[PDB]
Structure formats: structure tokens, C-alpha cells
């Protein structure tokens, strides 16, 4: 009996694309990004941000392209190390997700929350 109005038969599955199950892409994304060596974040959105905070602290100053790269790589590794640190806090809390509860605990033990 094709009611054609209720989706319990699931109506039609003819043009449904092959979609990955939730959380399955992260498995492949881990192996791709861990091996990857590219600079994670773009230069320009970071460049205007560091200039603004520098502008608040000190009047107009110049920057070099090497200085921008130095700030980016240290910052990116700082977050990546923190992300792994919070990841170990996530499993300790017995769940995959990461929230400020994970970050706040991580920032406290390693001396950042001081």
C-alpha cells in the first residue's frame, strides 16, 4: 500500500546520494591533517588581528612577513597541543565531545589559568 504521503516506507531511495555516516569523516580527516604540513589558518585574517592588538598597546608600527609566520606557527601549535590536551580530558569525562569544561581544566593544570 503506497500511501505516498507518509515516509515510513521511506518514500523513495532512488536519487539519494552516498553520504558518509556521522563521525566517519572525522576518521579520515584525522589521518589527512596529522600528516599535513600546511599553515592551517590564512595569513590575512590573522595579520589584521595581530596589528589591531599591537595598535592598542603601541602606536602605529611596521611588520615583516617573517614576523607574521612566526606568530602563526607558534599559535597554531599552541592550539593543536591544547586540542590534544583537551581531547585527553574528553575521554576522561567519558565522552568524545570537547567543551569549555575540557578547555578550562586543561588551561588550569598546565598553568594558563593563572
Amino acid at each position: 500500500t503506497k500511501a505516498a504521503r507518509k515516509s515510513a516506507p521511506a518514500t523513495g531511495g532512488v536519487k539519494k546520494p552516498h553520504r558518509y555516516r556521522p563521525g566517519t569523516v572525522a576518521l579520515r580527516e584525522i589521518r589527512r591533517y596529522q600528516k599535513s604540513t600546511e599553515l592551517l589558518i590564512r595569513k590575512l585574517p590573522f595579520q589584521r588581528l595581530v596589528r589591531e592588538i599591537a595598535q592598542d598597546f603601541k602606536t602605529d608600527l611596521r611588520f615583516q612577513s617573517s614576523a607574521v609566520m612566526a606568530l602563526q606557527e607558534a599559535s597554531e601549535a599552541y592550539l593543536v597541543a591544547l586540542f590534544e590536551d583537551t581531547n585527553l580530558c574528553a575521554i576522561h569525562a567519558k565522552r568524545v565531545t570537547i567543551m569549555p569544561k575540557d578547555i578550562q581544566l586543561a588551561r588550569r593544570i598546565r598553568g594558563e589559568r593563572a
Binding site: 589527512r32 591533517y33 596529522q34 590564512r42 592588538i53 598597546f57 608600527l61 611588520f63
Partner: protein
């Protein structure tokens, strides 16, 4: 103006033409950018609140590092922070980057 509620048509919502002159400067890190950092850290799933939290954590780290940079740059009268200044502002505590210098 908008011909529909969805994004099918032209510029119904979020039509942006201003490019961070004085807005969204802190919001220069997008959702996949935060996700990619999590992936390099071995994180499978993150919550919604981590998008704003990471930016707040990000601002703290840059502020602490660049607080020394302006003092370092002014001390040498160089007024142009270079790669050496960042290392000097980083080598003091943690984050001792060997990429540039010398």
C-alpha cells in the same frame, strides 16, 4: 527585497560587501579552521561553544606574546617587529620556536 526565505535566490540573507575594516577582525577564524586545529590534535567531535572559546583563548595567547614584542621593539628603536622579536617574546616561556632566527 528578498525573493525567498532560503538561499536559493540572490542575497536574501547575509549579503556582505564590507571586508573587516573595523568589524569581525577577531572573527577571522572560521569553523573549518577551528575544526582543522582539532583534527591535528586528534579530536573527533567538538561542541558549539568551542568556536567562541578558542577565539578567546587565541586572543589571550597573541596578547601575551605581543605584549613583550612591543617592549622588545621599542627597546631597540626598530619600530618593525621581525622574526627575532617573536622568538624573543616566545622563547621566554614555552613555545620556543626554532623555525626562524639567526
Amino acid at each position: 527585497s528578498g525573493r525567498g526565505k532560503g538561499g536559493k535566490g540572490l542575497g536574501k540573507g547575509g549579503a556582505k560587501r564590507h571586508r573587516k575594516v573595523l568589524r569581525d577582525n577577531i572573527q577571522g577564524i572560521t569553523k573549518p579552521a577551528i575544526r582543522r586545529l582539532a583534527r591535528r590534535g586528534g579530536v573527533k567531535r567538538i561542541s558549539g561553544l568551542i568556536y567562541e572559546e578558542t577565539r578567546g583563548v587565541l586572543k589571550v595567547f597573541l596578547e601575551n606574546v605581543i605584549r613583550d614584542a612591543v617592549t622588545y621593539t621599542e627597546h631597540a628603536k626598530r619600530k618593525t617587529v621581525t622574526a627575532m622579536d617573536v622568538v624573543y617574546a616566545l622563547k621566554r616561556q614555552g613555545r620556543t620556536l626554532y623555525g626562524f632566527g639567526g
